[PDB]
């Protein structure tokens with residue numbers, strides 16, 4: 231009844247009034263590629279390292295099952311598909327979303343969304359939590375708060391799925407393209423703390439964050455239990 | 462993200478851009494009570510016996526998984542829950558649908574929806590096909606044809622699921638209530654057709670009561 235016209239992402243959608251975690255359900259269940267798991271609320275939503283992810287009603291909490299047929303070396307870029315997809319959707323709603331490497335989306339430095347990719351071989355789960363009309367925790371914001379008015383959750387879902395499908399299809403053919411989209415939508419040229427501090431200069435051809443320390447030393451950061459903080 | 466507020470029916474919804482048949486998927490897949498299987502189009506949709514159900518894009522094609530804690534004798538009434546749910550939804554959109562025993566809903570005698578119930582173990586699958594904005598076979602009708610404008614498909618889904626959840630919850634407690642709702646919304650007092658006779662009513666088992674010209678009374682199951 232939804233009438234989705236996407237090629238892969240959104241071929242099937244499993245909606246829940248409530249769930250423990252869409253990422254957990256997606257990882258555990260036998261699901262086909264492109265299936266989207268979405269819930270009004272999560273009782274056990276999480277970020278990396280089992281960090282609690284607040285998932286009240288009003289937000290967009292979903293996961294997508296992917297089976298990317300690309301080199302093992304390109305798989306780490308899936309998180310960027312989620313981040314860029316969220317940014318594009320925010321821009322469609324006239325919200326200035328910017329990427330905080332490697333998985334966060336901010337609006338005026340406040341966290342509006344987070345991306346979490348979990349993979350176990352031939353199966354990758356792309357999880358996205360985006361605050362829309364829900365109340366948010368410390369250091370966060372939502373689409374409603376930035377626009378000053380409520381936004382139809384289904385409209386945001388449709389927009390995001392359409393963007394992700396396009397991004398994913400192109401990723402399968404040209405896995406390097408997503409890096410340019412990340413660069414054009416990420417927060418750069420400012421001081422950050424990885425510990426060590428320096429200027430976040432850019433991301434390289436592997437998606438590593440390039441940081442220039444005061445001494446001039448250049449470090450390349452691989453994401454994998456490494457968050458950054460803005461100064 | 463759908464924000465459904467129903468108690469059982471619609472707790473979970475599995476949507477497909479395309480599927481063979483929502484009833485077939487519901488029957489062969491393990492699904493919790495209340496799960497709704499819905500698809501934009503069905504390639505092998507079916508009615509009863511071996512009939513095909515035309516399921517092009519634009520219509521509402523869905524199945525609901527039930528596991529009703531009621532006596533065996535009440536199971537034949539599940540089809541009525543679907544038919545009445547459709548009638549109630551149509552009324553919300555200002556369309557007057559009438560039930561043609563035992564599973565059809567007609568508008569000015571043109572078929573707008575059909576219901577198909579199938580049992581698999583202790584799981585009951587309630588299938589409903591309702592023409593909304595899709596092309597329909599000759600003689601049939603759709604919400605779009607009756608209203609003269611494109612009808613928001615999701616709005617029809619929300620309405621129907623809300624009505625079905627209410628009808629089902631009441632059925633679990635008062636399984637006889639659905640019978641009066643059917644009677645007040647079914648086509649009776651007319652001749653029907655193997656034998657012919659007047660469709661007088663439905664009895665307490667949901668059987669169609671027919672009065673033949675000879676005066677004989679037959680009960681159709």
Ligand SMILES: Nc1ncnc2c1ncn2[C@@H]1O[C@H](COP(=O)(O)OC(=O)CCCC[C@@H]2SC[C@@H]3NC(=O)N[C@@H]32)[C@@H](O)[C@H]1O
Nearest residue numbers: 251252253275276277278281283284292344357358359370
């Ligand atoms: N609703 C919210 N909005 C903004 N920040 C939040 C938030 N809830 C928690 N946080 C903060 O964000 C941190 C988590 O950051 P991380 O970088 O590790 O992790 C993330 O940013 C990833 C979050 C992924 C969420 C989605 S919801 C759909 C799917 N199902 C799941 O169970 N997860 C995914 C927490 O430690 C909090 O400080």
Ligand SMILES: Nc1ncnc2c1ncn2[C@@H]1O[C@H](COP(=O)(O)OC(=O)CCCC[C@@H]2SC[C@@H]3NC(=O)N[C@@H]32)[C@@H](O)[C@H]1O
Nearest residue numbers: 482484506507508509512514515523575576588589590601
């Ligand atoms: N779209 C349509 N609208 C009106 N009449 C139709 C139609 N498609 C076919 N018909 C006619 O209706 C007859 C079928 O009537 P019956 O009384 O046997 O059967 C029915 O009326 C039941 C139809 C149940 C359909 C739903 S769709 C969701 C679920 N998944 C399935 O595969 N099935 C269920 C056919 O033989 C046709 O003549």
